Amino acid sequence: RRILVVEAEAPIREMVCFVLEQNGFQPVEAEDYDSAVNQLNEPWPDLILLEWMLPGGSGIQFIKHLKRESMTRDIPVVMLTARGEEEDRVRGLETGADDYITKPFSPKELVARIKAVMRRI
């Protein structure tokens, strides 16, 4: 599955990509909002992992943007946060994300979350 990993920190993206490739997914990287937007075209991501604090714009507007076109409307988005305190706050904001994972995360939790959202699509 093509997983778009949107996160500022190279070593974090790389840890994510490693876990995903070891598990048979096809991860690709975006370091900021515009890079992610530029990859909303063929080949389309099947799921997006989105850092809440991503440089370059708002995670709320990023998610609303996906809903603007039927093509991207149904792509699951898992929000990545920088620890549980931020996760609770972002849960509170009703951002429209499909699920949430906080950093640092285990390989088990990363795969479990991605699998769960993809299974219910």
The domain segmentation of the chain, as residue ranges, is 1-121
User: How many degrees, rounded to 5, is the angle at CA 10 between CA 9 and CA 15?
Assistant: 100
Q: How far is CA 9 from CA 46, 49, 59, 113, 119, in A?
A: 22, 13, 16, 21, 28
Closest of 65, 97, 57, 64 to residue 81, by C-alpha: 97
CA atoms of 104 and 9, how far apart (whole Å):
13
The vertex-42 CA angle with 81 and 115, nearest 5°, equals 40
Q: Selecting from 3.30.470.30, 3.40.50.1370, 3.90.228.20, 3.40.50.2300, what CATH number does the domain 1-121 have?
A: 3.40.50.2300
Answer yes or no: are the C-beta atoms of 31 and 48 closer than 8 Å: no
| Phi/psi of residue 54, nearest 5 degrees | -50, 135
Report in angstroms the alpha-carbon separations of 109 from 27, 62, 74: 16, 24, 22
The method of structure determination was X-ray
What distance lies between CA 47 and its chain's CA centroid?
7
At 10, list the tokens.
């190279």
Residue 34 near residue 6, CB atoms below 8 Å: no
Contact between residue 100 and residue 87 where contact means Cβ atoms under 8 Å apart:
yes
- Experimental resolution (Å): 1.7
* CA 86 – CA 68 distance, rounded (Å): 27
